[PDB]
Write a protein that binds this ligand. Structure first.
Ligand code: AGS
Length: 259
């Protein structure tokens, strides 16, 4: 496994819920130097938050999809370190903001498809991710993003009506939220319903109003987003079907870009 000696902290990366995340270098059993992010848990909330820290680590440790953040190892002895791959382009929302002028639709559709592949995997195990948003999606390379580790100020503007109304979260509410994430991506990181305050969102939804089609979003893709935002969760597509529709859209946008 991994030993603390094999991991050195170089700078701060940022504050996570449970504690500071640092940038470091892990050295392999083969002597390879891997750039890592090291998650830390603040020496605090006795058992409960510290149990939740470890429990979330073990899930991510068992997760292995090419478009979910990669857990490299866990150092359990106090102070506990979770070693993740470092994703050098940071958060998708920031990365979309910076590269607004040069990103084309092909790529926006590709990031959407990647996330949706990750969700199809989660869907296969009836595991609900409740934080499918550009702030929670990391950029591994211009062509590769990874869904972060996020499955009580709730993300109301990202949430399905059932979730806002009853705190029900199912794979179908993740489908609703995933379409909101597509909307963020296609809008270059705008916050959904930025023009409202949280308390106002449900009532807008309840009357059938939806996020408008982003300017660079193909109509075919907006129709997919529309189906995702069906009020009735049974009528929303499943992720396995989104993956197929999204591959088709991607393939069309590539041909269009190439010709
Ligand atoms: N593998 C990574 N590569 C690059 N930046 C990362 C990585 N993991 C986290 N970050 C960044 O570190 C900061 C926050 O870490 P997060 O995991 O988002 O915090 P969090 O979601 O509260 O996580 P925990 O487990 O709850 S502390 C943000 O800047 C993230 O973008």
């Amino acid at each position: 496994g991994i030993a603390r000696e094999d991991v050195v902290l170089n700078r701060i990366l940022g504050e996570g819920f449970f504690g500071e995340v640092y940038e470091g270098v892990y050295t392999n059993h083969k002597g390879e130097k891997i750039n890592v992010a090291v998650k830390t848990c603040k020496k605090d909330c006795t058992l409960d938050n510290k149990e939740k820290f470890m429990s979330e680590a073990v899930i991510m440790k068992n997760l292995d999809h090419p478009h979910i953040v990669k857990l490299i190892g866990i150092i359990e002895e106090e102070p506990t370190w979770i070693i993740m791959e470092l994703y050098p382009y940071g958060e998708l929302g920031h990365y979309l903001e910076r590269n607004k002028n040069s990103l084309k639709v092909l790529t926006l559709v590709l990031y959407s498809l990647q996330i949706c592949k990750a969700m199809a995997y989660l869907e296969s195990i009836n595991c609900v991710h409740r934080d499918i948003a550009v702030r929670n999606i990391l950029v591994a390379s211009p062509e590769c993003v990874k869904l972060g580790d996020f499955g009580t100020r709730l993300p109301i503007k990202w949430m399905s009506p059932e979730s806002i109304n009853f705190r029900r979260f199912t794979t179908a509410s993740d489908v609703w939220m995933f379409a909101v994430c597509m909307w963020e991506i296609l809008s270059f990181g705008k916050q959904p319903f930025f023009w409202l305050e949280n308390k106002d969102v449900i009532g807008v939804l309840e009357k059938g109003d939806r996020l408008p089609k982003p300017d660079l979003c193909p109509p075919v893709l907006y129709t997919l987003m529309t189906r995702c935002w069906d009020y009735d969760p049974s009528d929303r597509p499943r992720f396995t079907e989104l993956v197929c529709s999204l591959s088709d859209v991607y393939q069309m946008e590539k041909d269009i870009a190439m010709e």
